Design a protein around this nucleic acid. Sequence first.
DNA 1: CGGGCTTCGGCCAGAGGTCGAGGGTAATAAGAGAATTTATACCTTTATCGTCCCATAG
Length: 49
Amino acid sequence: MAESEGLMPQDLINAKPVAAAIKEFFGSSQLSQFMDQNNPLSEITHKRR
DNA sequence: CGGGCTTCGGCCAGAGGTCGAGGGTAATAAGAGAATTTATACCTTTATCGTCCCATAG
């Protein structure tokens, strides 16, 4: 319902949901987990998992 | 030929080792302003309870 003159593209889009989704996936997903750094081989076998 | 009567098929419930150990992540937006109640603060009024003088019973 907003007008082209009444609203600007920067004021229409809310970027909060995409940032929240990216943060949630990168911090709380099952596949996101702390790297095994006790061995250099542990890192390689974790990233190739 | 309707009717008990057995049987079968679809649907839902419940239950799935224990004890560790470590790590991480956990949840937001109206202002105004009017109104009503409530905790506060000062003050007076009555009773209460600590307190002692006094007459007396032995």
